[PDB]
């Protein structure tokens, strides 16, 4: 509430955007509201786009940026899931992100990078590849990175909008390890 | 491999039909390799469709036993699951459930009941009419419960396909909660 209005952009995807949730329930509009309870004047703008890959965000940056009254006092970046999701290159969303990054730099606006992890069903390689983007980019470009802000989500699954569970062929045969002593005493009775 | 072959229908949805997976790789076809190398003589027919309600499954259970070459001995029932997960009726998942089971009691096949739980998302009252379900028709009609044989898939997050995570409003607030300081101390540096 006390001092001049503090101006912060929201750049992200689904978690910025609040897929099938009301605007006010969405992060930027919580975290403003979070923000203002500890005495902040600060206005979040949220500019997430559910389904938005590092390219998508970088084919918007700079019109999103121009057609702000001003210049946001601080971004806040949050892509690479649907990347990751998609199975498209890590490096490509890596390349993406530094150029995102870039054009921010090249206006003097300072980035908080929110951090990104890979499913944990996917390769190693990829996964190494696609976790060290975040860390990498930030020392780079001197932004502070936030860690893995949807990791409470993964603590409590209560948090998340239910869907459908469909398992590898090692998640099918964890099924089976579960379950084959008791079929095999159903059978051996009938 | 010894004695007389056992015919045991897996009767399901996605979790048995096997969903982005080959048909060897799916439920009811390694769930009968691992049977087969405990030294059981059994077959494992895959009636698993993908999307099935307990509504579906109801309209298609008579066709499917009268087409197999003989009587099954045995029927694994996992069903409710994509009731749960549409929000349909916890009410209308047991009615369906319930007739399912008539129609194989009325036959003398026996059964395995495949438990389901609700979506912890989900309302306690839904919850709770919804997972008990299983035991309930499972004690009516004295057959087997399996249950929630997809629980390792809850453990080892890697044993399942990647999916986007959609928090609630009350995920959005744990977001919130585990960035605000950061987000608070970055901003009060500019
Ligand atoms: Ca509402
Ligand atoms: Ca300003
Ligand atoms: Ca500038
Ligand atoms: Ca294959
Ligand atoms: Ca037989
Ligand atoms: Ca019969």
């Not at 069903?121 to 696609?130: A, Q, T, V, W």
């Amino acid at each position: 509430p006390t001092g001049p209005a503090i101006d912060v952009l929201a750049f992200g995807d689904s978690l910025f955007a609040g897929y099938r949730l009301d605007r006010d329930e969405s992060y930027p509009a919580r975290l403003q509201a979070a923000l203002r309870e500890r005495g902040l004047n600060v206005n979040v703008t949220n500019a997430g786009v559910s389904g938005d890959t590092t390219a998508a965000g970088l084919q918007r940056i700079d019109f999103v940026l121009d057609s702000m009254a001003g210049e946001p006092d601080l971004v806040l970046l949050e892509l690479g899931a649907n990347d990751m999701l998609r199975g498209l290159p890590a490096e490509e969303a890596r390349r993406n992100l530094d150029t995102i990054l870039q054009r921010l730099d090249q206006r003097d606006i300072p980035v908080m990078v929110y951090g990104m992890r890979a499913a944990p069903n996917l390769g190693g390689d990829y996964g190494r590849s696609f976790d060290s983007i975040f860390p990498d980019l930030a020392d780079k470009y001197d932004a502070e990175l936030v860690p893995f802000f949807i990791e409470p989500l993964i603590f409590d699954r209560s948090l998340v909008q239910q869907a459908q569970l469909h398992p590898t062929a090692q998640g099918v045969d964890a099924m089976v390890e579960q379950t084959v002593e008791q079929v095999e005493d159903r059978i051996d009775d009938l």
